[PDB]
Scaffold this active site. Structure first.
Site, PDB file in Angstrom:
ATOM      1  N   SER B 108       0.825  -1.200   0.000  1.00 11.82           N
ATOM      2  CA  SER B 108       0.000   0.000   0.000  1.00 11.82           C
ATOM      3  C   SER B 108       0.870   1.265   0.000  1.00 11.82           C
ATOM      4  O   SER B 108       1.571   1.554  -0.969  1.00 11.82           O
ATOM      5  CB  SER B 108      -0.909  -0.060   1.234  1.00 11.82           C
ATOM      6  OG  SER B 108      -1.825   1.011   1.298  1.00 11.82           O
ATOM      7  N   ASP B 233      -9.286  -7.026  -3.214  1.00  7.82           N
ATOM      8  CA  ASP B 233      -8.819  -5.858  -2.466  1.00  7.82           C
ATOM      9  C   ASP B 233      -9.823  -4.715  -2.670  1.00  7.82           C
ATOM     10  O   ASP B 233      -9.965  -4.229  -3.784  1.00  7.82           O
ATOM     11  CB  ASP B 233      -7.434  -5.446  -2.984  1.00  7.82           C
ATOM     12  CG  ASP B 233      -6.821  -4.301  -2.201  1.00  7.82           C
ATOM     13  OD1 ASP B 233      -7.539  -3.610  -1.431  1.00  7.82           O
ATOM     14  OD2 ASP B 233      -5.599  -4.094  -2.368  1.00  7.82           O
ATOM     15  N   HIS B 261      -6.851  -6.732   0.809  1.00 10.66           N
ATOM     16  CA  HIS B 261      -5.741  -5.784   0.863  1.00 10.66           C
ATOM     17  C   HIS B 261      -4.479  -6.272   1.583  1.00 10.66           C
ATOM     18  O   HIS B 261      -3.376  -5.792   1.304  1.00 10.66           O
ATOM     19  CB  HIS B 261      -6.216  -4.478   1.504  1.00 10.66           C
ATOM     20  CG  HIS B 261      -5.281  -3.328   1.291  1.00 10.66           C
ATOM     21  ND1 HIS B 261      -4.828  -2.957   0.041  1.00 10.66           N
ATOM     22  CD2 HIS B 261      -4.700  -2.477   2.167  1.00 10.66           C
ATOM     23  CE1 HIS B 261      -4.007  -1.930   0.158  1.00 10.66           C
ATOM     24  NE2 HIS B 261      -3.912  -1.618   1.438  1.00 10.66           N
TER      25      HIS B 261
END
Lengths: 281, 281, 281, 281
Positions: B108, B233, B261
């Site tokens: 991320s 995700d 995620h």
């Protein structure tokens, strides 16, 4: 060392020429080549068959319309007719061999046929794998694909070499390029081959939409699909794999680098192992 | 059995709390967690560290702004300031340990920092791996991401549980869910934490564009990037990975199924081995 | 208990096979089935006729081109010709029975004919009801509809079963599925049926735009239209009903759940009562 | 004949003014009014309460920020804070009354709160109904909604009358129009009301996106949702209901004619019965 048997087999109405190898006691795997002038099982899979044959009973037929398989009396105008025939051919071929359930792998057009097969006869197939498949909507038809479909408008050798080169990531270093070009160019021009091929391509161009599997159907398929696509595939845009990966009930996408449209031949080093594990387990 | 050392280390200007493990003689791997309320190294990587430590010297720091790492005197208004600090932190941390070259992995937001790091100090890093990374343009910001950034507008526990649940594919069966929720909710609400977090999120929302690595730059990176993205995700759209996979000089994309995620935690069964091979070779 | 009379009736130029039931003294209701291979009045309405017959004089004809109704000498190339004939057929059928004014209900293609009828002979009809109607612009033609129109390109039984299954929300539990499939497949393949059907579908595909009722006309219709659409209808997108609901002078839309294209059969439990009230009052 | 009790009740932190009616032994139904200057429970539901009270224990509170309910010390800048408070208020109000499970109905903004409530406390609610709800993405903000949010920029009486008139399909014949206009205009201008209202509207405008329930969440809701929308609603576009109807696990949409934004008041003749059946069963 493995031995590849290559003969005609009774696969229902139309007989099919097919490359067979491996011990018939091992799980089966059917390989469906893509389309294109001079396309035929051997060119798409021969090189990787020994490896598959080591653990699987491998069956790679020349789909109706291609190779030395049996040709239909009349030549269908709709691509879908060609698909129904190949769907029947594969099932009839499995019947001949007594294969109740088999793993299936399709490339490009063989992918469209693969999707139809598992949709119609879900119970006859176990694990699925597709590479640069086309049973999905295309955003925009690449110029490479357009010049391929209109090849008979100018069937010269140079244009054909360019055509083939556009199937792989790096033509210059592809083993068997020129040989594949020259020899397949001979076949592609055969009066009888150029005959069926012309109408096939005519049906393919303007008529592929019908080939799209509805999202609602993809979402019902129980099979574990492994989608492969070359990062440099110039023939079939990544959009096809993404569509399939988005809607299938069980799917995973792998995008290989230094890889064009012939993934199984360009990056077998990565695909081979992944295929084995997908099938093995 | 491995032992994870967890202490403060001198990483230049601001010191960093970090989880360290493995034999310092083995190749190094730096792990960069993502953002979010209560986000910190331990939550993103602890579970998979023993496995990495077996062959690699592992270093997972709490990036400035998160965890027990040193906080800056003043709090930057631009997300880019936060990135420069974390870029400096990581390099300073590597310096402390005498690591000249290291493998790097970001998740991320840690991916955004990872991209900056390899862009600024290409020679300090070997192999790269990103999961649900954000150094790329987003088509449309998912509602899940919007409700995450505006969490302090209604920092109740239920909304927080929903927030966390939306990070994984299947919350109900995720081991450590409720515990992760409750304990991280305590931290996330700490007057001092909620203080820095608020401005951080404020800078993140309306200010992320600057985080996009230019295509021209991605195309120059010499590193072999392995991009991972969970098929489910809900926080970071697949568009980010596709953008990165499209422009990087050397990249390959793998899209895992039954994965949200937190790929490294949900499908370590598939990722673990792939990471090892990507690093090993 | 009601009795359904099923015979040929003089409906002008071409005679029509029709299912009739109820007391001729009660208000009339004409039912217009949709299109598709093997489509015919009985399949679309038989099951719900007893219920309608209880308070209404019910008339469900096999629209020209389908069933045992009279076929024209020559086969029109434009879908609009087929519509004019069915418009004439219905009016001629009403004339035969002495029905001056009647309630009308159309499904899919029967909806297109229903819109034309009330536009041409407003005074001959009272209350209207449409379900998954098509007299409107379609955003994008679903793959399900495309594979239906191109069915004769591969008229095998499995493809047909998939085709039928795609008409309802839950095929597995639909009473009479396989029976409906097998029996309708026989008819659909009849040399004479497949003959007219082929050209009909050819005219339908590439030629449906002309079927769109102008917004200016919909806005003038004095009738109270009740629009129905299944939330899971895969054949006709909700866009058609929304367009109609947007422009009609008097309209109300109801979107049923657990309902595909055959609303009258899948959710008669909710539709039946609503229809009754719409007609009753 | 029913009697409506209207007093303050302990609903946790902030107390709520609420209209209560019916026998506490009957199933409960909570009614959540929409927003707007002078908006309050009584105006949205009073007229239809007697009917609901006949079979249900009815509870219609003035949501925090509106009516005679308790106001917070400080005034939140983010609309989401207002939502969290109302979510807490409703739950605290149910607790006070000993209502474990209740049916819930929201209109416009009360719909946004309704969606949050069933998402956070699924088990506390049974059947849901929404009308002109806003917990969804809006295609384009109608000018009517824009002029409503910017009402305090020119809080004159005529502009207010236009504002109210735009809430119903036919103002001229709406019973209680002028009275509703004049009396609500007094309240809307109260120095203390205009105070909280101003910031509320400021938070609403530029800040509503966060109000969108993620599709993934709507698809998990176990409740049977009945969505209502007036065909002539000028405040909230039909796009909101369509979005909700598209993603909810269990939903059905009904679009009433001759109906604006106040469906419950304009077409109670059709809604009343439908609500009863949805709840009854």
């Amino acid at each position: 060392t493995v031995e590849i048997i290559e003969k005609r087999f009774p696969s229902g109405t139309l007989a099919s020429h097919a490359l067979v190898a491996g011990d018939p006691q091992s799980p089966a795997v059917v390989l469906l080549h893509g389309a294109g002038p001079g396309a035929h099982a051997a060119s798409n899979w021969r090189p990787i068959i020994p490896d598959l044959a080591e653990n699987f009973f491998v069956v790679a037929p020349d789909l109706i319309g291609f190779g030395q398989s049996e040709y239909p009396e009349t030549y269908p105008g709709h691509i879908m007719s060609w698909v129904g025939m190949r769907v029947e051919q594969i099932l009839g071929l499995m019947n001949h061999f007594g294969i109740e359930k088999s793993h299936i792998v399709g490339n490009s057009m063989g992918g469209a046929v693969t999707l139809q097969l598992v949709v119609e006869a879900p119970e006859r197939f176990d694990k699925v794998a597709l590479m640069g498949s086309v049973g999905a909507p295309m955003n925009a038809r690449p110029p490479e694909l357009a010049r391929l479909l209109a090849f008979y408008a100018d069937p010269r050798l140079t244009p054909y070499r360019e055509l083939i080169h556009s199937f792989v990531y790096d033509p210059e270093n592809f083993p068997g390029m020129e040989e594949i070009v020259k020899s397949r160019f001979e076949v592609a021009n055969d009066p009888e081959v150029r005959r069926i091929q012309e109408v096939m391509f005519e049906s393919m161009k303007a008529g592929m939409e019908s080939l799209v599997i509805p999202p609602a159907t993809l979402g019902r398929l129980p099979h574990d699909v492994l989608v492969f696509h070359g990062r440099q595939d110039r023939i079939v845009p990544l959009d096809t794999s993404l569509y399939l990966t988005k809607h299938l009930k069980h799917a995973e996408l792998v995008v290989l680098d230094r890889c064009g449209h012939w993934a199984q031949l360009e990056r077998w080093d990565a695909m081979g192992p992944m295929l084995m594990e997908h099938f093995r387990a």
